[PDB]
Amino acid sequence: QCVNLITRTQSYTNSFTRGVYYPDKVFRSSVLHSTQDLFLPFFSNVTWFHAIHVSRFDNPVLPFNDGVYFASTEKSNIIRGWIFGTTLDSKTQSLLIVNNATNVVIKVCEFQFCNDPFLDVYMESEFRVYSSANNCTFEYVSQPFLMDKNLREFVFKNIDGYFKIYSKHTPINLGRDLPQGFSALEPLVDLPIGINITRFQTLLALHRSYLSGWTAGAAAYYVGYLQPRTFLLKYNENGTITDAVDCALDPLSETK
Amino acid sequence: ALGKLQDVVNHNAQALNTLVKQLSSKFGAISSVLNDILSRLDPPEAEVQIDRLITGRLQSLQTYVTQQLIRAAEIRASANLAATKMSECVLGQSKRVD
Amino acid sequence: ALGKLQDVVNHNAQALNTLVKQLSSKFGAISSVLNDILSRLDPPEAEVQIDRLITGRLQSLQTYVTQQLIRAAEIRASANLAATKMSECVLGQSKRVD
Amino acid sequence: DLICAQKFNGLTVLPPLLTDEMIAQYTSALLAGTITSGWTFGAGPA
Amino acid sequence: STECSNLLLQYGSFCTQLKRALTGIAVEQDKNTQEVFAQVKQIYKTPPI
Amino acid sequence: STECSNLLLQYGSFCTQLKRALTGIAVEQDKNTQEVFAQVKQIYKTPPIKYFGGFNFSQILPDPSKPSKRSPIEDLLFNKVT
Amino acid sequence: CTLKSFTVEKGIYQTSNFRVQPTESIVRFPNITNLCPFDEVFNATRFASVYAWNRKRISNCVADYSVLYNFAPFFAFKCYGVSPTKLNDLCFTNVYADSFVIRGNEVSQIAPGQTGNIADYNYKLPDDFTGCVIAWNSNKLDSKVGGNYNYLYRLFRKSNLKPFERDISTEIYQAGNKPCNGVAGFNCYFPLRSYGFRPTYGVGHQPYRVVVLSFELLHAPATVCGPKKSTNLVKNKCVNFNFNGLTGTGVLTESNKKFLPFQQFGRDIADTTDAVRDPQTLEILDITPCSFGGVSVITPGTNTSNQVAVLYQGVNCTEVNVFQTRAGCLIGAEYVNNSYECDIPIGAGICASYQSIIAY
Amino acid sequence: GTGVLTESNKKFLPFQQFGRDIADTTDAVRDPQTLEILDITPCSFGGVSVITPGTNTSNQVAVLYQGVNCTEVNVFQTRAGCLIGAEYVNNSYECDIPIGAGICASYQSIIAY
Ligand SMILES: *[C@@H]1O[C@H](CO)[C@@H](O[C@@H]2O[C@H](CO)[C@@H](O)[C@H](O)[C@H]2NC(C)=O)[C@H](O)[C@H]1NC(C)=O
Ligand SMILES: *[C@@H]1O[C@H](CO)[C@@H](O[C@@H]2O[C@H](CO)[C@@H](O)[C@H](O)[C@H]2NC(C)=O)[C@H](O)[C@H]1NC(C)=O
Ligand SMILES: *[C@@H]1O[C@H](CO)[C@@H](O)[C@H](O)[C@H]1NC(C)=O
Ligand SMILES: *[C@@H]1O[C@H](CO)[C@@H](O)[C@H](O)[C@H]1NC(C)=O
Ligand SMILES: *[C@@H]1O[C@H](CO)[C@@H](O)[C@H](O)[C@H]1NC(C)=O
Numbered sequence A: 001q002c003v004n005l006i007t008r009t010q011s012y013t014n015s016f017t018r019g020v021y022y023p024d025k026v027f028r029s030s031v032l033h034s035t036q037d038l039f040l041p042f043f044s045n046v047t048w049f050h051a052i053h054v055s056r057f058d059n060p061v062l063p064f065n066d067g068v069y070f071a072s073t074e075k076s077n078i079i080r081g082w083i084f085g086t087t088l089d090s091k092t093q094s095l096l097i098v099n100n101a102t103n104v105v106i107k108v109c110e111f112q113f114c115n116d117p118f119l120d121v122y123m124e125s126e127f128r129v130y131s132s133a134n135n136c137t138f139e140y141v142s143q144p145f146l147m148d149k150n151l152r153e154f155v156f157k158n159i160d161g162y163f164k165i166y167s168k169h170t171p172i173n174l175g176r177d178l179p180q181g182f183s184a185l186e187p188l189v190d191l192p193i194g195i196n197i198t199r200f201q202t203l204l205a206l207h208r209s210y211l212s213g214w215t216a217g218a219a220a221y222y223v224g225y226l227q228p229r230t231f232l233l234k235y236n237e238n239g240t241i242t243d244a245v246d247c248a249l250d251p252l253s254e255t256k
Numbered sequence B, C: 001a002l003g004k005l006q007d008v009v010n011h012n013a014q015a016l017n018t019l020v021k022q023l024s025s026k027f028g029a030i031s032s033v034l035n036d037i038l039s040r041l042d043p044p045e046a047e048v049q050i051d052r053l054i055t056g057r058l059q060s061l062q063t064y065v066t067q068q069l070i071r072a073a074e075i076r077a078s079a080n081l082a083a084t085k086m087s088e089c090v091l092g093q094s095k096r097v098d
Numbered sequence D: 001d002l003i004c005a006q007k008f009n010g011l012t013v014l015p016p017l018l019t020d021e022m023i024a025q026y027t028s029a030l031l032a033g034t035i036t037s038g039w040t041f042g043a044g045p046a
Numbered sequence E: 001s002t003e004c005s006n007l008l009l010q011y012g013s014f015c016t017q018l019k020r021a022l023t024g025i026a027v028e029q030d031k032n033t034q035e036v037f038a039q040v041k042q043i044y045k046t047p048p049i
Numbered sequence F: 001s002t003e004c005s006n007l008l009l010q011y012g013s014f015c016t017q018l019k020r021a022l023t024g025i026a027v028e029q030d031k032n033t034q035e036v037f038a039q040v041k042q043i044y045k046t047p048p049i050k051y052f053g054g055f056n057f058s059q060i061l062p063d064p065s066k067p068s069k070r071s072p073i074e075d076l077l078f079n080k081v082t
Numbered sequence G: 001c002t003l004k005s006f007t008v009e010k011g012i013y014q015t016s017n018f019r020v021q022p023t024e025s026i027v028r029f030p031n032i033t034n035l036c037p038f039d040e041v042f043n044a045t046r047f048a049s050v051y052a053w054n055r056k057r058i059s060n061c062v063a064d065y066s067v068l069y070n071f072a073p074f075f076a077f078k079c080y081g082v083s084p085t086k087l088n089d090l091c092f093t094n095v096y097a098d099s100f101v102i103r104g105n106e107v108s109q110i111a112p113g114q115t116g117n118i119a120d121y122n123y124k125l126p127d128d129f130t131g132c133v134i135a136w137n138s139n140k141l142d143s144k145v146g147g148n149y150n151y152l153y154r155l156f157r158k159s160n161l162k163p164f165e166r167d168i169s170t171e172i173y174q175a176g177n178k179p180c181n182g183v184a185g186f187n188c189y190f191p192l193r194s195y196g197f198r199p200t201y202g203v204g205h206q207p208y209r210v211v212v213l214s215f216e217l218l219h220a221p222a223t224v225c226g227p228k229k230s231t232n233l234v235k236n237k238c239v240n241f242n243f244n245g246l247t248g249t250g251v252l253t254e255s256n257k258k259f260l261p262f263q264q265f266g267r268d269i270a271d272t273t274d275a276v277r278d279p280q281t282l283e284i285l286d287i288t289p290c291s292f293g294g295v296s297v298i299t300p301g302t303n304t305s306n307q308v309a310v311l312y313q314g315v316n317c318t319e320v321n322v323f324q325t326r327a328g329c330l331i332g333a334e335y336v337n338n339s340y341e342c343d344i345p346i347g348a349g350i351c352a353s354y355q356s357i358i359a360y
Numbered sequence H: 001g002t003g004v005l006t007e008s009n010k011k012f013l014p015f016q017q018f019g020r021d022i023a024d025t026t027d028a029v030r031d032p033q034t035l036e037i038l039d040i041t042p043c044s045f046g047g048v049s050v051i052t053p054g055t056n057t058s059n060q061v062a063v064l065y066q067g068v069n070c071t072e073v074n075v076f077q078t079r080a081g082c083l084i085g086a087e088y089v090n091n092s093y094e095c096d097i098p099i100g101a102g103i104c105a106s107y108q109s110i111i112a113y
């Protein structure tokens, strides 16, 4: 039941100082800590994707590279999760993250993914996400991380068997979607997956029309790519990362 | 105005901080924590790892003592100059120019 | 007549030359070249050989910096004396004997 | 070639802040002050 | 050599200490020259005769 | 760690050398302070009437109001060095 | 003893460092106890081939390694980053069991930094590997008289594998200048070849079952722990504690540091452990080093007297003729209001003399 | 190794293959394929120094590549090295930030004089 419904346009914006996360699970207070990790570089080129369904294949699969910074200003019901893998068919393993109103299901199987996968509500069906799922080797159900203007930021890394997801939810006063300042993302889950991830895709939810089988919808999201970079993070009195300098961005920050 | 004295304070704290920072160096060993090395290895190989940590920390401590001695010599020269100024400028009138 | 300044130049160049010559010291390793050690040995063995070269070269660099600091202290004392002679012999007439 | 070897090994000579010409100029100023003004220039106006 | 630098990072801030000491010596030499020669703030010149 | 100390004993009198050098520096600093400041064996005091023919030394003489008994200049110096 | 002389001159001498010793050892481990499925890995009838080696994740169990020792036909039991006897006392995460079958002579190649065929194209170990390799002969089960050809290895590959990478692609290899186009022929060979395992052969060629246990050390929350029992927690006392394999000597106190839910350990400016979050009870215990200081022995000459006083540097008098000074706590000297010249320097304006030993 | 291979004026004897400096560092080599002498000279390196005023005042910076000619890297050539990001001014002022070889830098933009 794979149907091509989503068309996608893309623009380029500035990352500013978004994308900082806690590099480990160690509490540090009122210190300057220099760490080398996969970070989103400051003022880097981030692609803004607008995915539109109106009531042919124009929704290609994005690369994963060394890790992905994901952001969205949309509500929690439009963007419902992600797809990770290499071939996205029955010959290789793949990771499916699906959120709904009650919980999140993270599941690694041999999914035969559709070219334009989307979760359709009518109850929720995954027959437009994939056509088959066999030899399934991982399942993890937990509390959702898409809950209810509000900018939602995620960092995905695939390091030595673990898919690390970092998340932050920030109330952004009406203005530029990617705001200034620092909002450090916190580690949300480390999943012992151990699969090869080179490509990824965002999952959207579409409503049936009952009148043009699916309701028309739009979703805007920002994707940036992490690079191996050395950061100097400032930990305040309460352990929060309130500031950072990217060591290789400019000579002033390199001096810092 | 008071840059010189603060500089001396700045050097001393930094030297101690560097010496403190040197405790976080593996020095070619599996870990920088001695308790982990004891808790994880048998004495034939733990002795080797502790030896690597001991030689690295001892080299750091000798380096710190060497710079402390050099700075002590510089401060002693400055103090001797200060004592000479106290004797000749405060306790008398000096005809030495500048 | 001008041996002292020439001596300073002679010491500095020789110290740099000695530091350069320290790069051609095996320090107990199979070779003084990192490339040859890396190509001709397996990673754990090469790691050990390189770490021997690293500790030997680091000891040489610390020795050079320490002797440079001591010579810097000597030159600083000589410069302070030269400044005192500049102030008291050139900018005024000195009643200090010799 | 002696300087070249040091440069190849990462040892760099830093130039003196005061060049030989400016140090010579300072000595010239001191000589002119001590010849034309005696010790007055060292203690105040020349 | 990248491998040598990776092994060198295990020794910590020895490189920082050596660079800082040499930087202190380098600024000290300029300060020494400034103390010895720059004792006047007026550049005097001799008369033409 | 006792085992670390046992292995450290094989290196000899390095620890004694470092402690002796630091102790020498520590006594040297006190000797430096004695040489600079303790050059008079009489503690002189100013007269209660601070009139010196028009010369004002309030900024350098000790302030009775302050608990530290320091001069205004000395108090400023202590505040400005941290 | 410190001065190596039987006569001590008048003065203050630094002799040793006073430190309060721990009173009891507390071990805190997760309360959860589940028998770990080592039977599945070690007692299985069939193992995978070296090109398609089986990886099993071990997590959320308590492991008793003593039974591994109790029953063991394992000719080789070699550990690299950890002691075999200390495994019961440590906590781990990232535990993996890698099972495969290789030759008798190939057991040396399952090591970090080894050059070989199965090392490069079948199973690669990292240089920083920690864990234990287990090898035992399997002639009785993994061999047949007619030849057991079920175990295959990758003889040919374009490039070396990564650590913990499995290659099961049955694509042809081009061994020469001429392209092969997916068809075997001259200079075109299949990459996977089977072992000729027969019981009649001598040692060195018999099939060997190898299981590699891989761990990580302390850099994540641990889920696999040893059989050690959890003890109760004690506050405000010098104890030697063991939190999830982290051993330290300090006083555990209540903390006001707002730890985030993921955060476990705590660190100071020196990146040394300053707080811990216990797995069994999710509370934050601040770790403070036990009281210590330098002891200086103030004494006059042995010609004059044998009385001594001790100065504990930087230590308040309530944590050890008792006088409190800025330098530290002075025991054995009586403070005298009367001011005299300095005889034995103590510090912070305080000097000592012999008249009994007085401090002023 | 790694280095530039320039033409050499050194006349090697027929048995010699490599060449060394006074300080025992390789300075020459003979090519095996064609019997010619090349002066192995390592690739350019420099000490990157950052000249900046206080962050309280401004965020403008200048970069000094010590020992590097400006053609091998607001670009000015000094005897200390190549200074990028500061504009040379023919006026003379007191030294604020020392650069070297008589060059000093100040903030007014960042000027070098
Ligand atoms: C949201 O997702 C959860 C998890 O996939 C759904 O809960 C499951 O529903 C199925 C219905 O066939 C049950 O068999 C499972 O036992 C449920 N699992 C859990 C953990 O509750 C839930 O139904 C979804 N909600 C909607 C509205 O689709
Ligand atoms: C000496 O100098 C002090 C301060 O330099 C003078 O004290 C000042 O007195 C004036 C007028 O009485 C006040 O307005 C100031 O506030 C005072 N300053 C301070 C710091 O106290 C003092 O009057 C001078 N003369 C004598 C005789 O002491
Ligand atoms: C981002 O990339 C696109 C194409 O790679 C380019 O056209 C655009 O100028 C870039 N944006 C910025 C801010 O550099
Ligand atoms: C991951 O998959 C891509 C494409 O399928 C492949 O080129 C790459 O070599 C794979 N990497 C690993 C480590 O398997
Ligand atoms: C994958 O599934 C197919 C059919 O569902 C099966 O033939 C194959 O053996 C499975 N592979 C594994 C590793 O389970």
Ligand SMILES: *[C@@H]1O[C@H](CO)[C@@H](O)[C@H](O)[C@H]1NC(C)=O
Binding pocket: A236, A237, A238
């Ligand atoms: C830190 O925590 C305290 C106490 O919860 C709170 O009052 C304060 O606002 C927090 N933030 C900062 C920056 O101090």
Ligand SMILES: *[C@@H]1O[C@H](CO)[C@@H](O)[C@H](O)[C@H]1NC(C)=O
Binding pocket: G039, G043, G045
């Ligand atoms: C191991 O397996 C054998 C046969 O496969 C069985 O007889 C034995 O009881 C098993 N032992 C354990 C401890 O499971």
Ligand SMILES: *[C@@H]1O[C@H](CO)[C@@H](O)[C@H](O)[C@H]1NC(C)=O
Binding pocket: G030, G031, G032, G279, G280, G281
């Ligand atoms: C046991 O530990 C778990 C954490 O792994 C915790 O959630 C639980 O409350 C603990 N149980 C008891 C009785 O302390």
Ligand SMILES: *[C@@H]1O[C@H](CO)[C@@H](O)[C@H](O)[C@H]1NC(C)=O
Binding pocket: H032, H033, H034, H035
């Ligand atoms: C080696 O081959 C080159 C290329 O044909 C030729 O010029 C040269 O004469 C040959 N012999 C030697 C000794 O280099």
